[PDB]
């Protein structure tokens, strides 16, 4: 089940943020959130979709192996951070959209649709273009669904080889310590339109000693100056819960 | 092929220390070292053996899976950092000797001996006690051999499932950034005499952007105060190579 902790809304009100944090100890059957209504509301996954897309890319053979280098041959890209050769992990961690847009094209509608059904990934709507359905198309996923999906990944229970799940998991390590390990992925759909804000994400899980905590955060956003809030608000909530001080 | 870099002896000489650093770019077919003769000399692996031990424990089912918890029975251990339940990653990173002595016994000699031949691990001599051959027994391995073994692990080419090579690899992650990942493990056999000295190790590999560097360091320890040099000497060489930063 899931519990509503209204105390957590303090971290949101202090910054006038409309968002939701979902936090789960040990498993998906012991979770809490600041907002039950928004916890199950479905939003564009934006770059958080690079997690399933990479798994599907390895499954289908589009990504030959974990050692494949995605070369940059000089085609101008929307951010200089993407204008370089990238590993699979690098492409994920810098959110190299063009790399994963080409992966999407090579996977194709049929295989993409099949794996999203197998992963129970959101509304499973890939309309809007095979290389943009997760960013400006019709794909939507809730914070609870992200936690469920990531828990499956952590347990190697996605319908894919354990090998490929493990490959993507190390690619998601963002903080490493002897008894403290974080897998996570951020997302940002843009600033949105007039009275249609964008969405920003932070999702992943934390392994502290022999315990695990899955989490998913999203917020409405209409300016890039608010991006750091997608990390600081959830980090403060987790710090409050003793998930490392 | 291995190249000698005489300039890399600066720090060794200034501290009056006998040791070797082996550093390889892309593959073990492009290695350089400060001392060609010592690069091939074999030494007690000490805790660096936890890497092969961890893999063998998984291959044989002694370690159930990536989520195995090693319980602390509450009776005293030599170090308070070990008096707790630990993941496989935790066991490796805090170098929990008693956990890996128990692993070895369950593996047994027939299978340990088998896998050390499969891995081409040093002189493959596990005399000295099934739970101590790598600490005070007859097992010996060279810096060159460590690099070869670690390269095989990086490539998933060891005679073991890719599954378990991937499990142990994430367990070895020590530093993480979007385009910089480090797998490494230290080891130290204890202070010896000026004539029969101990050995201190640093081994691992650095993934920087799309490049990979394999390294193995060891040094003779006949005074406990020289042990910090096991990190600073190789760190200085890798800084001068432009790998760090
Ligand atoms: C994914 O959602 C988009 C890209 N991935 C990320 C992300 O969520 O980290 C963004 S946000 C980009 C990262 N560095 C920039 C920054 O920090 N400032 C401008 C302050 C913003 C990308 C937009 C995908 C749609 O490209
Ligand atoms: C395994 O080899 C033993 C541990 N390995 C290490 C080591 O290589 O560092 C030590 S020494 C202890 C832990 N790290 C500290 C250090 O490096 N400095 C203080 C400089 C000291 C152990 C002996 C395991 C069998 O205990």
Numbering used by the authors:
A (entry chain A), B (entry chain D): 21 to 265
What did the authors write?
Despite exhibiting stronger carbapenemase activity towards ertapenem (ETP) and meropenem (MEM) in Escherichia coli, OXA‐655 exhibits reduced activity towards oxyimino‐substituted β‐lactams like ceftazidime. The new crystal structures show that L117 is situated at a critical position with enhanced Van der Waals interactions to L155 in the omega loop. This restricts the movements of L155 and could explain the reduced ability for OXA‐655 to bind a bulky oxyimino group. The V117L replacement in OXA‐655 makes the active site S67 and the carboxylated K70 more water exposed. This could affect the supply of new deacylation water molecules required for hydrolysis and possibly the carboxylation rate of K70. But most importantly, L117 leaves more space for binding of the hydroxyethyl group in carbapenems.
